[PDB]
Design an enzyme around this catalytic site. Structure first.
Site, PDB file in Angstrom:
ATOM      1  CB  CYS A 109      -6.513 -30.241 -13.306  1.00 47.94           C
ATOM      2  SG  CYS A 109      -5.998 -28.557 -13.090  1.00 47.94           S
ATOM      3  NE  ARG A 126      -9.124 -24.678 -14.693  1.00 46.33           N
ATOM      4  CZ  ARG A 126      -8.542 -25.716 -14.088  1.00 46.33           C
ATOM      5  NH1 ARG A 126      -8.161 -26.789 -14.801  1.00 46.33           N
ATOM      6  NH2 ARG A 126      -8.325 -25.673 -12.774  1.00 46.33           N
TER       7      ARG A 126
HETATM    8  O1  LIG Z   1      -8.745 -27.213  -9.120  1.00 47.25           O
HETATM    9  O2  LIG Z   1      -7.926 -27.541 -10.317  1.00 47.25           O
END
Ligand SMILES: [O-][O-]
Ligand SMILES: [O-][O-]
Ligand SMILES: [O-][O-]
Ligand SMILES: [O-][O-]
Ligand SMILES: [O-][O-]
Ligand SMILES: [O-][O-]
Ligand SMILES: [O-][O-]
Ligand SMILES: [O-][O-]
EC number: 1.11.1.24
Lengths: 243, 242, 243, 242, 242, 243, 244, 242
Positions: F49, F125
């Site tokens: 992230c 995601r």
């Molecule tokens: O490992 O977001």
């Protein structure tokens, strides 16, 4: 807005009362290895129906030659059927040899989806062509105002039996198809490799890999089918009303 | 079993995409005073379907003369339809003049009950004969392995229009019925007094009060119908494969 | 079991197709001030049914004199009805003057509860006696194997009309009741004070306060009812089969 | 509308309380090889009802001759039944020999569809004719204002028993049918070949293949049936009121 | 909205008809220990779709070298698929070697959530990356008007295989991540004690306890992934339209 | 086995709390005439992230150049978001300029179909490309173990906008398509007459009536899109962890 | 309204992810014969929550001495929990020794009825006191704007434990009840004969048959409870903000 | 489990019968601009309950000073309530000045979720703190065997009132919090910009942008709150049983 049986489905299992007795469908015919044409008509003692019964009766030998039985159906009683058959034999001189289902209440008619929007009470002019495994192969729905072309029913059954026996599809208007005449169609390839192989073989007359055809039907098959259409097209010598 | 439209019902209202554009059924044809024959076929680029499109195209002027239009239907796309028509014109030399509905998803086919037990994916060879009121008049369901007899579709429409016009029912095998020939049938009386009056009048040729007929069709109309059947019965002089 | 319309209910509102044309029940008769007997039979061109139609036809003027119309009903078509009437006229020499409802599908039959366990397809021999208000007054259910006694249907309608007009109940076996003969019954008191008053009057012949009667039917009405029963008991001297 | 038992159905299985005790229907009669007539009446101590019980009582031996038992039914209590029977014997001079079902709350009445629209509170004048197999053969529904013709109930049972034993259908108004008199009808052929065979046999008097008859009933059976109607038609010699 | 299969779920069990024959998914591939990319396109004989097929064809050996099969899907028939492949080979000079599912009726499209709001009739440009255990690993949904970048599909499969074998997470833009380059990420600690220990161990390059990385991928594997991206960025020397 | 919004649908109307404040989607951007990329990530203070936020932040001016806003989303609180931003600025040297939705309880995540079988608790995601009319144009779902290629998201939004502006479809791998390079595709004809009219005009380069294209994009459009890919393929000159 | 577990019910069986790892409630504690106080807080990196964590940490030895474990809960992730604990140790100088459940998505929150009308997104300040049989014994729901009084939590657990071991009920404000002081209450008779016999025995101090009591708690037990309340009432001599 | 009213919800509208008469909640108190503490107890003439009533009555003036009314609740009748009050005044020498709801049938108890698993018949020791807007602000649920600490109820109401009036949050253990003493907390920023501004302003004492505080409470308010806790901790000078 109405449910019907479907092509490729087994004909609905049912016990039915005919003017020849009580039988089980499709078993009565399946168990004898016979195809059958089940057709319906709105009403005994009505004119278009009478013309159709006479047409089927005249072609009865032609159906017999194919190993195909005939069975009618209306919402009238067996007593009506028998009286109507007497009338036809008496006034037209034609004996109706095949059974008619008596379906007062329309139990059979509803199961076959024969009650359409023209009439709440009487069936349309339905036709079910059923093979010897009891599978529905073709269905026609003509209306109360228009009699059938019975020779097209003979052509349908004949061409279906031919197609089954030769593993071939049957072109439009056979045996007088405008592209390939009395030719019959090889079912098209369904894979790329099969499509390629078929071409590389040079086995068939062909317009593309998906359109191959040959002439495997006997002269007898071809001319008998053609005879049905010739008969349909011929102005009658002598009308039955005259005598 | 499956659900279908029924004879006597208005053709179900629907917007459809054809290779001529988007149209509303049956309104598109009702608006032009036209009958239409909607027919389906399992797949573009298959041989029986190809022979049927060629037969319909050959008969297209015959339909037009009767005030009838044609519209096809399969689960293929418009791009397929246009390519297939290109193929037919190039290889067979026949131009297909009428639209074909593109029904990927089978939305239209399901509405019409055209997906039977032979195939999960492609329609059977269905035929809907629809009049200029948008009412279904006749339905035929041929299977994938057997092409239609297109001259019978012409006979059906010609006979229905004549019957409607002349207020007559049409006997088996018309215009070559074995009992009454090109004769047309008077709809039977439905009451005892009507039956007695009909008979007393001596107006019609008759076998009984419920079987009366006459010969109201023009010679031209009769000969047109016989022409359809003669064409069906005749082996073509030259085949298009050659 | 099965659902039927009930005594004291208005006859189910319905449009019906008869061999005389389409009519609305019970309005068609109500609007003329007519009672009607709607009866059903299992099938045209069956023997018990034929005997009943002949019996009703023979008694038609008796019903008409009472202001009662007749209407039959079966699952057969109008064409069958008309052909059957022709046969009866030609072979028995009796014209059937009243309409028959054609109920192919059994729509009316189900509505009336006429499909019992003897047959899935044909109605029982039902009888509905309907007054000029359109209210069902009596219902009979005879089976396929047993013809009705049509003079009892006359007796029922005559006696119901009399009771209505004279404000009287009708004893068993009237006009030949074993206790009071052609006497008619005063509807019983329903309060103690009414009971005491009726007795105090000495107005009526009486066996108790709840059993009072008098003789208000005319000689003509009594004789008319007696004639129905004498006819029922009388062997015809000449049988219609003979000619 | 309302539900009722149907002809050809086995009479509903039930235990019922009568003024003779508790019995199971139809088993009580089936086990004896007897038919029974179950009838209902609106109310004890009402006049039409009284005339009917007297008529049934007078005809009791005729029912016994046929092997038919009688059983009544109303929504009154057993106490009422026994008091009403005392009253009838004392004032009319007639003993009522058969049981009456006591059905306060109309439980049995509801099961038999004997509560109609004219009264929410008392049964109609229903009649169920039940054979020795427990099967309902005929049903009659007369109203509160009109008494039954009990001789017709006798004729019905007599004729059904005759039809069963002789394998025959019974014409309208039998034994005084206007077409065939005391003749009995052969159930009609149901197939074309059966119809043809019956005609070729010459076995029966006939009007058509579907209308054959003969005269298999004994003089005794015919005259017995005719006597019920003669009695119905006879003006009483002496009135029991006198 | 609409229903889709989800990442981490086994690919929906189904028999499908392709232009190579009938196969069972995901079994056909699982049983060989192969990953597969199932991708959909709206229509045969449409231009973006044609460009994508040629792109996958050009990359087919790269997929094969990774042990990844390709399988296409649209609502067109097998006959259309075969004709379209013929067209591409004849006109572009590229042979499409992988199967395409034929889904007329859209049964498979519906199961895979491939019918979106832009078209009622044709699928979007979906991509399912499915591993050798049959598990869905990534899903992409491109629209009708925009062709895919096929080299990113290669990068995805390459990166997932490396992450799986090396037990590592893969950074944004790998192998060219701006923070750690070709480095791969150690799955972060999920307890306090584990976090403390990782730091006390000094085992990894680290920005904090939850951000540790190393460089376990081979030069060959890194170079292979870089090659996909270099090709994506390069203008072809020779365009096939020429 | 999970519901998602679909391409062509308006982005679900919702009020969301971000670390920049409460805004209404898609209205906030629609009202400014802006496209937006809404993307999600499983958790603040996790490494993949963090790399993606840094990648988006580095490309922020490139999104701005196109008139496209960025908005993130995770199930973390606004406090987490602000702390995480502080960390990234301090430790990586990169300021995250765009808002992040705080979605504790996963209400927004569920509406967008962002909870897959990988985790009951954290979002995948996901990437939603939304146009200035608020319509979803493309959706990508990457898993927790695999970071996105942000330059492809730039190529997607550039190409979508370009196709909208020029009324063209975009070939595979544009502007480096193997067949037509930087050419753009005319949407194919959907009728026979349109197909023949296009062919007769000779207006476009063409491989068939359904495959016509031209080169209407400016050199600036083409080279900007190619630059995203060049950047994606370039080994970084210096790594941010070093610095 | 909303659904909550109830006093007298076994604590809802559940697997929870904490910043110490995954454990099973109430089993993890039942298996050790330990009571536990599960408490929730709206959000890591918020100030009232931080003050309450420091308060529980300061009282951690007192809880351990009683055989009572502590476990926190918020909708924040494990990563947040760990970073927050790092921040508290660094800036306040207090180590938080006990686990905190991470409940993103609010699955556990919902099951315990910790989402009230104040906030759709973050839990209220709930407290569940759960005994060694896994049974819920007391529940407190404080709001986001008001920090708890942690010494009352100690008083509750001490007094319930005493009540359990001594078979006694505990008066209002114990050990400083205004009527009976540190006295503990005999559970009242529930039948007439039992009432009559209690009075005839002369066993206990009494105000009526239904109000009997004695003084069975040790001086040490009483003083321990008093100490919690004395601490609650005392202003700290040194505030932690001072020594950052 | 069982359903309860929630913090932040308006108190359930209800008519209740008390030993002072019938009142409507929360309106009776909202009308006066007063807060109320509604508490329940399992049963009159039970000992823990008696001690709690005496503790509340001793603190009545402290509640009044704050503008907070008290109302009790059990499933006992008004007759029991009055007799119990008589008992407490006669035997303990304490007058209970506030109303108690009589809830036989448990209609109010059920509505407030006061029936827990300990008893099917009697309520738990619940406490609802309700503000002058009728809104529930805090709820506590003590069990049958454990009496409440009534000084903590005063501290809760005082602190909530102070937070409301000063627009502050109240730290753990206030006014004796171990970090900030009698300090009160500024609700934390909820945006990045707001966080930055607050830090750049230098307005507040702070540990971080999300932990700012000041000392806005008067000495009178702080010492009053501390006195509740001092009283809680003090050994009573004289026991009322003596
Ligand atoms: O490992 O977001
Ligand atoms: O059949 O007319
Ligand atoms: O169609 O073959
Ligand atoms: O009717 O026999
Ligand atoms: O019974 O009248
Ligand atoms: O695909 O255009
Ligand atoms: O937490 O403020
Ligand atoms: O209350 O003890």
């Amino acid at each position: 807005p109405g449910s019907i049986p479907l092509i490729g489905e087994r004909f609905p299992e049912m016990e039915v009362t005919t003017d020849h007795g009580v039988i089980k469908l499709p078993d009565h015919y399946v168990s004898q290895g016979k195809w059958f044409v089940l057709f319906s008509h709105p009403a005994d003692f009505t004119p278009v129906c009478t013309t159709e019964f006479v047409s089927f009766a005249r072609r009865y030998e032609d159906f017999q030659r194919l190993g195909v039985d005939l069975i009618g159906l209306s919402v009238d009683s067996v007593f009506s059927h028998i009286k109507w058959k007497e009338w036809i034999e008496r006034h037209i001189g034609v004996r109706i040899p095949f059974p008619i289902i008596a379906d007062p209440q329309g139990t059979v008619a509803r199961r076959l989806g024969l009650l359409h929007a023209e009439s709440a009470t009487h069936t349309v002019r339905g036709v079910f062509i059923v093979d010897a495994r009891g599978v529905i192969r073709t269905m026609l729905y003509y209306p109360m105002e228009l009699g059938r072309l019975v020779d097209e029913i003979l052509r349908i059954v004949k061409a279906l039996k031919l197609g089954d026996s030769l593993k071939r599809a049957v072109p439009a208007d056979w045996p007088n198809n405008e592209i390939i005449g009395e030719g019959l169609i090889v079912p098209p390839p369904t894979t790329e490799d099969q499509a390629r192989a078929r071409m590389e073989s040079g086995q068939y007359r062909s317009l593309d890999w998906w359109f191959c055809w040959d002439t495997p039907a006997s002269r007898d098959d071809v001319e008998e089918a053609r005879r049905y259409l010739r008969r349909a097209a011929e102005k009658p010598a002598k009308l039955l009303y005259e005598e």
